[PDB]
Design a binder for this molecule. Sequence first.
Ligand SMILES: OC[C@H]1O[C@@H](O[C@H]2[C@@H](OC[C@H]3O[C@@H](O[C@H]4[C@H](O)[C@@H](O)[C@@H](O)O[C@@H]4CO)[C@H](O)[C@@H](O)[C@@H]3O[C@@H]3O[C@H](CO[C@H]4OC[C@@H](O)[C@H](O)[C@H]4O)[C@@H](O[C@@H]4O[C@H](CO[C@H]5OC[C@@H](O)[C@H](O)[C@H]5O)[C@@H](O)[C@H](O)[C@H]4O)[C@H](O)[C@H]3O)OC[C@@H](O)[C@@H]2O)[C@H](O)[C@@H](O)[C@H]1O
Ligand SMILES: OC[C@H]1O[C@@H](O)[C@H](O)[C@@H](O)[C@@H]1O[C@@H]1O[C@H](CO[C@H]2OC[C@@H](O)[C@H](O)[C@H]2O)[C@@H](O[C@@H]2O[C@H](CO[C@H]3OC[C@@H](O)[C@H](O)[C@H]3O)[C@@H](O)[C@H](O)[C@H]2O)[C@H](O)[C@H]1O
Length: 386
Amino acid sequence: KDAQAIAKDMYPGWNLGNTLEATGSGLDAETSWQPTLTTQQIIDAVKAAGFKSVRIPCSWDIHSDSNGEIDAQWMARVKQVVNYCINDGIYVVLNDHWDNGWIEVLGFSKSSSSYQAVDEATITSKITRLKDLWTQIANEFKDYDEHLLFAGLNEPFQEYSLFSGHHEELTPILCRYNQAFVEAVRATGGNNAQRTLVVQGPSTNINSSVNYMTADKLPETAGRLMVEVHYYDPGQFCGTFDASGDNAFYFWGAANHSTDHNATYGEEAYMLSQFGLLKTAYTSLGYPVIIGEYAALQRTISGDQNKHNASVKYFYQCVNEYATNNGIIAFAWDTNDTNGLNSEGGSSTIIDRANSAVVGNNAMEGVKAGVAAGKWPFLEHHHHHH
Ligand SMILES: OC[C@H]1O[C@@H](O[C@H]2[C@@H](OC[C@H]3O[C@@H](O[C@H]4[C@H](O)[C@@H](O)[C@@H](O)O[C@@H]4CO)[C@H](O)[C@@H](O)[C@@H]3O[C@@H]3O[C@H](CO[C@H]4OC[C@@H](O)[C@H](O)[C@H]4O)[C@@H](O[C@@H]4O[C@H](CO[C@H]5OC[C@@H](O)[C@H](O)[C@H]5O)[C@@H](O)[C@H](O)[C@H]4O)[C@H](O)[C@H]3O)OC[C@@H](O)[C@@H]2O)[C@H](O)[C@@H](O)[C@H]1O
Ligand SMILES: OC[C@H]1O[C@@H](O)[C@H](O)[C@@H](O)[C@@H]1O[C@@H]1O[C@H](CO[C@H]2OC[C@@H](O)[C@H](O)[C@H]2O)[C@@H](O[C@@H]2O[C@H](CO[C@H]3OC[C@@H](O)[C@H](O)[C@H]3O)[C@@H](O)[C@H](O)[C@H]2O)[C@H](O)[C@H]1O
């Protein structure tokens, strides 16, 4: 099955966040940034909630020896986790995540403390390391069917203090890295030649992607390729900045404004406009898009808790409705922080992994409602049964 054929069956998505991407050196990294060892039962609960795909952020460079070889015991554990999903018919998007910045930062600056432009020696060295890693991953997973997708990077040059204002300059470098990932995977043949691969836009940012990373710059023609962006607007509601205290947003959507802490931008029309840009640039050209991460903070607040809860629901509804309508699959960012739900600061957690159950009910009702209201667009060249 090709990218269009799988895409229509992939929504909605969910992330195994703060799990296999944690930057620890051992298997114990899995429970370093969140408490719960992954099990089949937990994945079963993700499926039972209604998710059809799981993005598995994963670190690999941090799990490698000095010769670049990925620890065999780490590889085997990642495979077990992937298998929990495949056992359930869940689509998996397996990435190489921030991974201590080895390419996400140092592929684009020679310094982590200030912007220092990279040169050809840097770029070619990062290409080779990227291909090394992805050769190892691809070969381990070669006999996996179309349920397994690979995503080469995470959020290339997203680090604002280093890279803001350098997107035009850096996007050609990212194109080279995306191409190197695809080349390495495809070379391993077998199911890897037919697998759908996911390449990331500049800073996983919609505006920069549709500007600088037009479809003609992608490493393959349409068929077995998707494009990934992330979506965290407005940050004070979603949790990326100024997201607690007086600047925070608790209420989102006009129907949901209250006494204070109202969103002042980034509401439904903004979201729809942004997702439309992705339709124009990518999905209308046969490249399905994944919103590989999105979230809203579910909080406990002193003010109108019902209106906050409704805002969380409505945000998840809008993301998933509008994504579906535009040929986009959205993946909820979920780090298994149940405690934060019981504070003003909030949490984006939906699944209480320790109890294999949904705890973020507003968010999850919103996911379900949004997917039900959406209408996936089909881009076909032959008849399908439908
Ligand atoms: O050790 C990590 C390293 O991180 C660098 O930052 C990069 C790294 O961020 C990790 C956060 O990821 C974020 O999701 C990303 C997502 O991966 C991206 O794709 C993109 O979308 O952006 C988002 C946002 O950055 C997660 O949502 C976020 O939780 C991750 O943060 C790590 O969280 C661990 C778990 O704690 C969190 O959830 C549990 C809650 O109860 C906590 O409230 C909440 O913080 C943290 O591990 C825990 O660490 C504490 C000790 O640290 C704490 O106290 C000292 C402070 O300095 C620390 O900031 C604070 O966290 C332990 O006691 C506990 O046992 C342990 O579980 C972990 O520290 C934290 O980083 O990857 C994404 C990149 O974009 C980031 O640049 C930092 O730059 C580097 O300095 C270093 O911290
Ligand atoms: O009623 C207000 C307040 O009154 C005090 O007198 C009392 O001590 C407080 O408990 C109470 O605050 C609510 O507390 C409940 C939990 O209550 C139990 O534990 C504490 C005891 O003191 C109570 O007697 C017990 O019944 C909170 O409910 C929990 O809320 C979380 C988080 O909810 C949010 O995130 C998930 C989302 O789906 C929700 O809609 C959203 O509100 C839930 O996961 C949990 O199931 C639920 O028990 C309540 O939020 C406090 O206001």
